[PDB]
Amino acid sequence: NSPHSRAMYVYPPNVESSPELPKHIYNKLDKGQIIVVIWVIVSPNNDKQKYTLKINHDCVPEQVIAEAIRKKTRSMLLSSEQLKLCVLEYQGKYILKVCGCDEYFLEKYPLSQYKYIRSCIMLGRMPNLMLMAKESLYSQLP
Ligand SMILES: *[C@H](CS(C)(=O)=O)[C@@H](C)NC(=O)C1(F)CCN(S(=O)(=O)c2ccc(Br)cc2-c2ccccc2Cl)CC1
């Protein structure tokens, strides 16, 4: 069984039944966009890095990663194309986990469809996601 299938079995997304947001919830956002907080502990140093993005609620976990790249990288003054290219090279190496929990964003559903994210919006809290390598997760697998 592929590491993908094992992940998918073990860490199934906890989601709402449909991707449609009720207005009462959509209207808590700024123009449909959610403010989220991406944590990373990377490389050899394992320093606590932290980016705060503002993204459409309906983005897919990987598009969230993409904005994570854009944010970290903005001081490189890269061109659109130099950037998008790199984003295409990198996006797929990593996934999102809820900080401290064992809840993963392993599914191309919209972010606000995930129950964690929807709960945050309701409670008016910022989601705290954690960015990590696919290899990292495949290694942790029972
Ligand atoms: C393209 C690379 S380049 C030098 O122009 O060819 C630019 C747009 N991207 C990056 O520099 C980047 F995508 C490389 C990968 N990460 S990372 O900081 O090296 C990183 C390594 C390991 C983990 Br686990 C997580 C991350 C990471 C940290 C912070 C934000 C996003 C990520 Cl994926 C980011 C930058």
Author numbering: 157 to 298
Excerpt from the paper describing this PDB structure:
To understand how our covalent ligands for Cys242 blocked the interaction between RAS and p110α, we determined the X-ray co-crystal structure of VVD-442 covalently bound to the RBD of p110α at 2.83 Å resolution. The compound covalently bound to Cys242 in a hydrophobic groove between α-helices 3 and 4. Thus, we expect that the molecule does not block RAS-p110α binding through direct steric occlusion. This model is consistent with experimental data showing that binding of VVD-442 to p110α disrupts the RAS-p110α interaction. VVD-699 and BBO-10203 are structurally distinct molecules, reflective of unique paths to discovery, leading to differing mechanisms by which they disrupt the RAS-PI3Kα interaction– VVD-699 binds adjacent to the RAS-p110α interface and stabilizes a conformation of the p110α RBD that is incompatible with RAS binding, whereas BBO-10203 induces a direct steric clash at the interface between RAS and p110α.
Although physiological activation of the MAPK pathway is RAS dependent, the interaction between RAS and the catalytic subunit of PI3Kα, p110α, serves as an amplifier but not a primary activator of this pathway, and is less important in normal cellular regulation than it is in cancer. Mutational studies have identified key residues, Thr208 and Lys227, within the RBD region of p110α, that facilitate interaction with RAS upon receptor tyrosine kinase-driven recruitment of PI3Kα to the plasma membrane.
